[PDB]
Amino acid sequence: TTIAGVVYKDGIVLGADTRATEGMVVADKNCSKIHFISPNIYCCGAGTAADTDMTTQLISSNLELHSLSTGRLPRVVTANRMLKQMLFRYQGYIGAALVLGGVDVTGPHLYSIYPHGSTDKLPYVTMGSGSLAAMAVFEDKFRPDMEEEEAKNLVSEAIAAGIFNDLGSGGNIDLCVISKNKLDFLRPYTVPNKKGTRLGRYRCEKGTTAVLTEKITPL
Amino acid sequence: TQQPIVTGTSVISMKYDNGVIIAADNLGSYGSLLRFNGVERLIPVGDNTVVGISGDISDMQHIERLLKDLVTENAYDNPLADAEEALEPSYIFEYLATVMYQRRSKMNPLWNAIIVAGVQSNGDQFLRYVNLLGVTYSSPTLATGFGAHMANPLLRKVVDRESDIPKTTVQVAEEAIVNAMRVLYYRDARSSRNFSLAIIDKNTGLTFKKNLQVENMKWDFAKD
Amino acid sequence: SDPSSINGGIVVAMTGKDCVAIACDLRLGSQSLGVSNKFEKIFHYGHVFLGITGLATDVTTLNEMFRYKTNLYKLKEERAIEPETFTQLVSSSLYERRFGPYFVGPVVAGINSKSGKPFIAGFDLIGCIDEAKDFIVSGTASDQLFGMCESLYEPNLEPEDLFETISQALLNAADRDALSGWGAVVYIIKKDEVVKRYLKMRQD
Amino acid sequence: TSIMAVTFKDGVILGADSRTTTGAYIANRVTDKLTRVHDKIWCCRSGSAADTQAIADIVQYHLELYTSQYGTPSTETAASVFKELCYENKDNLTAGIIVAGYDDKNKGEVYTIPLGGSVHKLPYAIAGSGSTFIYGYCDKNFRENMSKEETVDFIKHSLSQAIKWDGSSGGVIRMVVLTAAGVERLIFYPDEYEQL
Amino acid sequence: GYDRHITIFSPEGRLYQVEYAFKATNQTNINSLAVRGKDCTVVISQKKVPDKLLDPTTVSYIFCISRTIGMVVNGPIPDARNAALRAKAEAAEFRYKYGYDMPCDVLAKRMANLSQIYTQRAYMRPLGVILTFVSVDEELGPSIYKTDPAGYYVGYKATATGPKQQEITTNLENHFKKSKIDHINEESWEKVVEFAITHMIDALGTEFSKNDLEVGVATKDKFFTLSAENIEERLVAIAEQ
Amino acid sequence: MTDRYSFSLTTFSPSGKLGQIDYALTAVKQGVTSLGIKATNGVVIATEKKSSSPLAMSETLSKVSLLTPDIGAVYSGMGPDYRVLVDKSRKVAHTSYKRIYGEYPPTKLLVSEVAKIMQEATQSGGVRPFGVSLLIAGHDEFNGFSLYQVDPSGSYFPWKATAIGKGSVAAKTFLEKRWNDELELEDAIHIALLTLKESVEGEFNGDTIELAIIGDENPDKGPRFRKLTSQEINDRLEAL
Amino acid sequence: GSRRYDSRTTIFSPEGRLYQVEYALESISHAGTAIGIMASDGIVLAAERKVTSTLLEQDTSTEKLYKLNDKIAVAVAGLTADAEILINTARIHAQNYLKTYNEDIPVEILVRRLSDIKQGYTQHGGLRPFGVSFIYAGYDDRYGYQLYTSNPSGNYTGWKAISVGANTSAAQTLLQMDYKDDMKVDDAIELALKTLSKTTDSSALTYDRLEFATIRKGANDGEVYQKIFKPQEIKDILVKTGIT
Amino acid sequence: TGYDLSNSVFSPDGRNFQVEYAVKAVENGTTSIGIKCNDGVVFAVEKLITSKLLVPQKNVKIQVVDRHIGCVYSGLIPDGRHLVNRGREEAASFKKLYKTPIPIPAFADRLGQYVQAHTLYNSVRPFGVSTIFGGVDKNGAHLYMLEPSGSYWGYKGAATGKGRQSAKAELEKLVDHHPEGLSAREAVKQAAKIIYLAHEDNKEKDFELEISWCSLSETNGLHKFVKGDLLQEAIDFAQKEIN
Ligand SMILES: *C[C@@](C)(O)[C@](*)(O)[C@H](Cc1ccccc1)NC(=O)[C@H](Cc1ccc(OC)cc1)NC(=O)[C@H](C)NC(=O)CN1CCOCC1
Ligand SMILES: *C[C@@](C)(O)[C@](*)(O)[C@H](Cc1ccccc1)NC(=O)[C@H](Cc1ccc(OC)cc1)NC(=O)[C@H](C)NC(=O)CN1CCOCC1
Ligand SMILES: [Cl-]
Ligand SMILES: [Mg+2]
Numbered sequence A: 001t002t003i004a005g006v007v008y009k010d011g012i013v014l015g016a017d018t019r020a021t022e023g024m025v026v027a028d029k030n031c032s033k034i035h036f037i038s039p040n041i042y043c044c045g046a047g048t049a050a051d052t053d054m055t056t057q058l059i060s061s062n063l064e065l066h067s068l069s070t071g072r073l074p075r076v077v078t079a080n081r082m083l084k085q086m087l088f089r090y091q092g093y094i095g096a097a098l099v100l101g102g103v104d105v106t107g108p109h110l111y112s113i114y115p116h117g118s119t120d121k122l123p124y125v126t127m128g129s130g131s132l133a134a135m136a137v138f139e140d141k142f143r144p145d146m147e148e149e150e151a152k153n154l155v156s157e158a159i160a161a162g163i164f165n166d167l168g169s170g171g172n173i174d175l176c177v178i179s180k181n182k183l184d185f186l187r188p189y190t191v192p193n194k195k196g197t198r199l200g201r202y203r204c205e206k207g208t209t210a211v212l213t214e215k216i217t218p219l
Numbered sequence B: 001t002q003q004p005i006v007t008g009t010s011v012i013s014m015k016y017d018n019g020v021i022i023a024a025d026n027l028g029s030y031g032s033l034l035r036f037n038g039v040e041r042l043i044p045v046g047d048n049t050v051v052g053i054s055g056d057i058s059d060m061q062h063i064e065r066l067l068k069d070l071v072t073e074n075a076y077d078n079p080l081a082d083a084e085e086a087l088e089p090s091y092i093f094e095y096l097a098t099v100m101y102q103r104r105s106k107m108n109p110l111w112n113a114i115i116v117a118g119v120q121s122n123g124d125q126f127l128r129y130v131n132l133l134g135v136t137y138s139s140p141t142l143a144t145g146f147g148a149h150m151a152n153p154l155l156r157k158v159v160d161r162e163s164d165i166p167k168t169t170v171q172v173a174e175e176a177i178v179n180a181m182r183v184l185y186y187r188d189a190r191s192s193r194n195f196s197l198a199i200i201d202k203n204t205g206l207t208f209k210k211n212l213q214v215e216n217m218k219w220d221f222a223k224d
Numbered sequence C: 001s002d003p004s005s006i007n008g009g010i011v012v013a014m015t016g017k018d019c020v021a022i023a024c025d026l027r028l029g030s031q032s033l034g035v036s037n038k039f040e041k042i043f044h045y046g047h048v049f050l051g052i053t054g055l056a057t058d059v060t061t062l063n064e065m066f067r068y069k070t071n072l073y074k075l076k077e078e079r080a081i082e083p084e085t086f087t088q089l090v091s092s093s094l095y096e097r098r099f100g101p102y103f104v105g106p107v108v109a110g111i112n113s114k115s116g117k118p119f120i121a122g123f124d125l126i127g128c129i130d131e132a133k134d135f136i137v138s139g140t141a142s143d144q145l146f147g148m149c150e151s152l153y154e155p156n157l158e159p160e161d162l163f164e165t166i167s168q169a170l171l172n173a174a175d176r177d178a179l180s181g182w183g184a185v186v187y188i189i190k191k192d193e194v195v196k197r198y199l200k201m202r203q204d
Numbered sequence D: 001t002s003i004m005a006v007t008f009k010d011g012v013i014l015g016a017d018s019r020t021t022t023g024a025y026i027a028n029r030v031t032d033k034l035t036r037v038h039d040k041i042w043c044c045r046s047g048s049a050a051d052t053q054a055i056a057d058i059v060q061y062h063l064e065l066y067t068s069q070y071g072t073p074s075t076e077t078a079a080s081v082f083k084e085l086c087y088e089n090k091d092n093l094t095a096g097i098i099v100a101g102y103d104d105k106n107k108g109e110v111y112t113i114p115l116g117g118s119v120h121k122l123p124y125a126i127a128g129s130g131s132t133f134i135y136g137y138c139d140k141n142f143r144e145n146m147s148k149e150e151t152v153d154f155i156k157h158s159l160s161q162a163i164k165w166d167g168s169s170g171g172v173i174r175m176v177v178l179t180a181a182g183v184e185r186l187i188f189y190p191d192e193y194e195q196l
Numbered sequence E: 001g002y003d004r005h006i007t008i009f010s011p012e013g014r015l016y017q018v019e020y021a022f023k024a025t026n027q028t029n030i031n032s033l034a035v036r037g038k039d040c041t042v043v044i045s046q047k048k049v050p051d052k053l054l055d056p057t058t059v060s061y062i063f064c065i066s067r068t069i070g071m072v073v074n075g076p077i078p079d080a081r082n083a084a085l086r087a088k089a090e091a092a093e094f095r096y097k098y099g100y101d102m103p104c105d106v107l108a109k110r111m112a113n114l115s116q117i118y119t120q121r122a123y124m125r126p127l128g129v130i131l132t133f134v135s136v137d138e139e140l141g142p143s144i145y146k147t148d149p150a151g152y153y154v155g156y157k158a159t160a161t162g163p164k165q166q167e168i169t170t171n172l173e174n175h176f177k178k179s180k181i182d183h184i185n186e187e188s189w190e191k192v193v194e195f196a197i198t199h200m201i202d203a204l205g206t207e208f209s210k211n212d213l214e215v216g217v218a219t220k221d222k223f224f225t226l227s228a229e230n231i232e233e234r235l236v237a238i239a240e241q
Numbered sequence F: 001m002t003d004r005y006s007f008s009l010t011t012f013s014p015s016g017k018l019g020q021i022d023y024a025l026t027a028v029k030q031g032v033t034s035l036g037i038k039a040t041n042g043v044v045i046a047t048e049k050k051s052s053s054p055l056a057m058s059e060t061l062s063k064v065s066l067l068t069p070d071i072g073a074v075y076s077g078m079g080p081d082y083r084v085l086v087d088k089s090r091k092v093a094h095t096s097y098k099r100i101y102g103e104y105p106p107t108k109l110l111v112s113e114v115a116k117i118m119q120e121a122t123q124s125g126g127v128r129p130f131g132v133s134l135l136i137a138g139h140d141e142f143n144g145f146s147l148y149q150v151d152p153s154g155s156y157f158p159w160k161a162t163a164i165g166k167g168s169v170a171a172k173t174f175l176e177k178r179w180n181d182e183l184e185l186e187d188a189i190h191i192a193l194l195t196l197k198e199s200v201e202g203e204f205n206g207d208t209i210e211l212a213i214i215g216d217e218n219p220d221k222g223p224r225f226r227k228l229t230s231q232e233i234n235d236r237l238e239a240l
Numbered sequence G: 001g002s003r004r005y006d007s008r009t010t011i012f013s014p015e016g017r018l019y020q021v022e023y024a025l026e027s028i029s030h031a032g033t034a035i036g037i038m039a040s041d042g043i044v045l046a047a048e049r050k051v052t053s054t055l056l057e058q059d060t061s062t063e064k065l066y067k068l069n070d071k072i073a074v075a076v077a078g079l080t081a082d083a084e085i086l087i088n089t090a091r092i093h094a095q096n097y098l099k100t101y102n103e104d105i106p107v108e109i110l111v112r113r114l115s116d117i118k119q120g121y122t123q124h125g126g127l128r129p130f131g132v133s134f135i136y137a138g139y140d141d142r143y144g145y146q147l148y149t150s151n152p153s154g155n156y157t158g159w160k161a162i163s164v165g166a167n168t169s170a171a172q173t174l175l176q177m178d179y180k181d182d183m184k185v186d187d188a189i190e191l192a193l194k195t196l197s198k199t200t201d202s203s204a205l206t207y208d209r210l211e212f213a214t215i216r217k218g219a220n221d222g223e224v225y226q227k228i229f230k231p232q233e234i235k236d237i238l239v240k241t242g243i244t
Numbered sequence H: 001t002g003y004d005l006s007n008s009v010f011s012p013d014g015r016n017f018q019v020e021y022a023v024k025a026v027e028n029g030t031t032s033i034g035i036k037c038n039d040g041v042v043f044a045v046e047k048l049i050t051s052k053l054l055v056p057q058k059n060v061k062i063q064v065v066d067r068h069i070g071c072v073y074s075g076l077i078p079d080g081r082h083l084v085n086r087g088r089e090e091a092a093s094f095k096k097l098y099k100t101p102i103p104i105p106a107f108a109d110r111l112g113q114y115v116q117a118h119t120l121y122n123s124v125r126p127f128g129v130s131t132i133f134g135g136v137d138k139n140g141a142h143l144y145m146l147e148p149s150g151s152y153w154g155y156k157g158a159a160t161g162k163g164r165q166s167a168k169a170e171l172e173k174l175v176d177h178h179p180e181g182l183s184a185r186e187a188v189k190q191a192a193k194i195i196y197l198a199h200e201d202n203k204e205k206d207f208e209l210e211i212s213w214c215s216l217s218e219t220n221g222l223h224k225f226v227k228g229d230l231l232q233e234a235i236d237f238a239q240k241e242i243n
């Protein structure tokens, strides 16, 4: 998986590929990896896919209840703590590797969370099999306080690097732009590969398969 | 189950006519790294007992706190805490021996070898050993780890059996202990020059000596 | 030893124009020994269909479990569960055994009764949802099914065109797997009729 | 990791590199390994990043609750809480922590807590993979009651060498100065320290 | 008449043990007041040291719960300390779990929910205290929130608690009716404290020395209580104008 | 400390009355008036913000609570008891429903879960019943708009319109005359404001009234619950 | 301590009665009447709602008739909340039995289970009993059509026709007078409504004050169908039988 | 009425009568006092000699907590011992975690919260003791007194039991006549006098004086019992002042 995030001038840009795999087989070519935590906080997810889905959902649910009780928007630090403390408790067995990004009362914040419960707070991060390919792009071209369309391009360029150079990553590029004034959930942002066109029609004609018996029941 | 990390080496000891002597170097090794050069491994309890500890230093510090806490607890509702109902070497030992064997039996041992040296109410010399397995024994000379192999042979030449204890003076016994500490410094790769020594005598009481050093070192035969 | 390939078997599902299709083989074995050729892997709870491959004791246990849950659902909600909702129920249920899982490969198929939208889905053994429009595959010949489906499939097929596509996908994939086959079933599901067909295939 | 805490005349200074590794990959090159458990009690972290963060967060909680009830805790008290966690959970943890703090009564103090969970109060302390390479240098060059500028130089030179030889250490040298005057954060970049 | 001994309903739909816990609130015979500035929240309370043998430095009903939150209690000291220790524990746990300082109102609601449990569960008695929480919240600004034995809680522009609360309340009500604003329009907390003391003097009709008062002040990022000499400086300024 | 109250504090009297439930209902009677009205394209719920002091900020005290995005609640009786029911209702909507099915519960089932909690306080050891009656308004895809009442017993009933608390007998009669099955949401808000004016003594404006709706989606969906602003109420009071 | 406030809900009186059971039965005597009538080709359940305003939404309302599975239903008399606790327990027991044996639970086994739960609250725990009496209408392939009742004591019995709740004395006499063994469902529908029409404390019996249901095997291919009657359908059957 | 039959029940006043009844058991007990001095504290107690068969100096009433805190109490003696046992557990757990010995204010709240807890439930009885305690910590000397309700404050001087009014009057004179402070050796002498003067309320039976003290200079900040010559010197001073 290639997931990444950057802190730009007005806020946060998150990025992800769309390839889900089993063994060496691609099960889903357009799989969504950018998860909703709260209205101002999203989370990209890599690692064991089930663990990624359920861990974000549980912390999203608990933050919703937290936010209803306090009456104010949740913070990224609390999303970061709740994820961190849970992953630590389970000593790495919950194989979730997250890029957590959001915009608070205190401004924009970006985190990377590891399966063992360590977190780094950074202006740019990358995770998954494609993190090196994506990090190469950030080390080449990142600078602090970027404009929005520039930051979008850099993250898109970093996910692409993962898509093409890493066999674990592929499909489309999803972005999520988060600032004080808006949330832009772009799915897909880019379609870097056209779906391969088939030259023949291999579908069989009616009555080609051999049937033994039949039953019809109405509903 | 653990493994020892920061470790202390030999604790050596012997009986003499009026009391007991105990000694141990001031090193906390971290494998081959001679990490901590100021570690005290003789820990006095009252004015009649010294507990010498080798092995894991974190577990030694734990035992040190248990003994400190034992003194506090014995004082509670005890008007004779500094007299007839003070802590005895035999009481302090039996406690530690109970703890050590309990911990080995839960498969979570205190990774140490301990020698309790002291003098009892009636003037009797107390000297007994206990380790991580709960194994206990007493002898006119006692030594842990490396010292068992090198110190005991030398110290046993002074006190070979029980009947030699009244014949041995404090000067003869202290010389033997300091001599043995030199021999261990030549030959133990996880030892140090700097050590502490403690005499517990039935007449003169507890004498605790810090910052001693191995001296009179023969190296001149090396140049050839 | 590997629980997912003791008993063997396969399930495939596809979408079409105002219809879905789900199909499975009939084999149950103990590795090399074929035992039963009447072990169906597709069940239904109202209008929602569930195929399950993998360890056969878990296939049976989960069927019994989802019948239980969907029955109580209907009593309380006063309506039959929909495919979208049932998919989430399967995922939850599998993930609650995260560190002692059911060794299964479930596949949901059905038509949402209100919207009329065809729906399929698949899961790993701990409940991660594969949420694809085209097709879902599962079992010991999953690789074989992936290849068959990717080259045969196209969108918006009429029910009897789709029947030929899913059937040929199943049959040719099963014939390249030692632990699949021994017969096959295909359900063609429309908004208010369901056609169940047993297929003639080689019995080795 | 290369970390150290050094007492001096006006108080104490903590120092650290900024490298975090996953095998050969530098996962974070600008890491902040100096963390605050109280106003003027800080620690240096080495070992598992997850373990040291989890510990440091628990200590921060304990000292906040201590402060609520009993006022400012001593540096010794902070070290004891770190020790208690590290010793009692020795089988499940990989943490080597240096605790450093400034009282007005006691002035600067440094406590080191190695893998075992033992505590050692020292004039200065070094720890982490890169510390092996500077035992010789630090022992020869350390003096007691140094000035602030001397202690900043002593730490800068020491960690410069630790970084030079240890692949596991690198990046910037961060420092945190603890005196009566307050808390000062210092940073030193490769172009400065490499030419020393 | 056991419907008066435990927390169950009387025929009228009343909880007499809750009502009697409210009466325990005034047993100390101390009046407290709280007001809000622009940048600050001030809480003042009467201090009475009747015994000459008492160490007057230890006689306090104001508590530093967290660095940002302060709490004044109207009620007996054992129940006050019970409530203080819990609020401190709760504020520490919150910061650990959620990574930011517990807001004033969230603590108030939490303590109120605990108070509610004692009104519904029979084995627990209500605490005989009213808790006034104060802070300068980083989202809501200067804040006053109050809790009672019923488990009720609400935010306040200003408030007063004690035997002579109604007199203090009406005094404050009349001032805000003039100014037509929710706060004391003042830059420095020193002048907001002076206002708080002045309006208590007017309402209660008693003069105060430095040892008759106890003051707490919340600013952004810290709550602190004033010393006797800090209050004396405050009393001098009031007298000089 | 042993919680020795392992026995019921609500028991049947010789007449077949459950005393503590009746007494809890008496507490609900003493509480401030609240009401609910169901239109064709929405539901409205409303109550008076009875301010305990003018120094108190009544905006902080919310009598009308969001339970899920499409379900709202209001009450009459003891506020602290209501608050803990809202907390539990919100939580049970996640634990026993959203984390299982991936969607919010329908109005009737969430109501049923709240009713269950209230029933348990009516039979469990060492507790009194809750001293509130709730009015829960909501929408869901398969049942549409709905309005429910929940009493201290745990009993619940669905309503076209109703009122609870202080002036409920008079308010229910007023609603019976005005209600029909062809009301639009604006017509129901208009009737709610008329009905609520009868039971209110003092000031009658957007600052002393709390009023929310379950209506159209406000921009996966948008939430159908909306709390009307102080200004939005006052606008409709001029066309009153 | 706490002993002072304990009502002691699980004791005998000097006469050998359980106080709380007796008082719960008194509570149930004031609840709206429910009637069950078993015919050769089906079972009828009829029940009277209580208090009712013009503003009660009837079509989405369920206070009397509940569904336990596809074969078994209950009519309730007493505290509705208490009944719903027990109903959800019964609904689970039916599904546990289905999961274990792969066969639908026999009616008597379900009834005994619920009745055993009620019994437990009278013998231990120190809690009040459930203030509920059920009429169980069900079918299985051993005994066919079955009617039972249970009450707060945990005692249960089988019936050809039975009433619970208010005016059972009057209701049971009227049923005993007009019931016959060869009777059919359409006739039993008419008997159920006529009995309520006479025993009701209201001025007249109308569609809005009734809940009604039938369990018929009367379906295509000999399968059991539960029919919970809608408001409009209860109004039609009231005109058909000639009550309105 | 019936509000006084059960602990933790509020009367219509807002009072917990069971606690106020515990106070009566405290008032019934022997006189015990505490005096805060320059660098420490002094504790003293009246021990009634019921019979000639009581062994002198053996039935010790004052109890030590940790090594730096002294506790004395009036009322039901076993209830006092129960509280000190808990105090010792609290001090032990504090030192185990935080290393430093428990501060006196910290220790005071530990007893306070525990005593207060025994006024929250009808399943427990309140403590039938007022407890005077204190010692020397990092912030200097502290003297406390803790009542059955859980109430405690800091004191310059403290007194409880049957002779408390007599003692309180004497303590109030010392506070007025020594604003600059009292020395530790002075406080021991004064403690002896105050117990002897407060013995007029228990004058039927003769008594035995017991004194203890923590002082930064005289005991190195550790709790010790006053014994031998220093005790006899304090008794002689007390005997001279009554005559
Ligand atoms: C680069 C890639 C594809 O690995 C990226 O990290 C994916 C992130 C993702 C997030 C949300 C939805 C979908 C995909 N991850 C996957 O596709 C994972 C890869 C993976 C397989 C196996 C293991 O084992 C530790 C880890 C990661 N794919 C899955 O999780 C698939 C759906 N399920 C399985 O492979 C079944 N295994 C069984 C053993 O336990 C782990 C789950
Ligand atoms: C010299 C160095 C850089 O290693 C120093 O000791 C680091 C201290 C540090 C780093 C970041 C914040 C605070 C303090 N430690 C690391 O960089 C550690 C190295 C390490 C890993 C594992 C263990 O023992 C189990 C000891 C040291 N790096 C990490 O913890 C990184 C983030 N995570 C991993 O390497 C993942 N592994 C997977 C296998 O299970 C253990 C964790
Ligand atoms: Cl809460
Ligand atoms: Mg997904």
Ligand SMILES: [Mg+2]
Pocket (backbone or CB within 6 Å): C174, C175, C176, C177, C178, C179, C180, C181, C182, C204
């Ligand atoms: Mg085959």
Ligand SMILES: [Mg+2]
Pocket (backbone or CB within 6 Å): C203, C204
């Ligand atoms: Mg074959």
Ligand SMILES: [Mg+2]
Pocket (backbone or CB within 6 Å): D163, D164, D165, D166, D167, D168, D169, D170
């Ligand atoms: Mg390097």
Ligand SMILES: [Mg+2]
Pocket (backbone or CB within 6 Å): E006, E007, E118, E119, E120, E121, E122, E123, E124, E125, E126
């Ligand atoms: Mg109570």
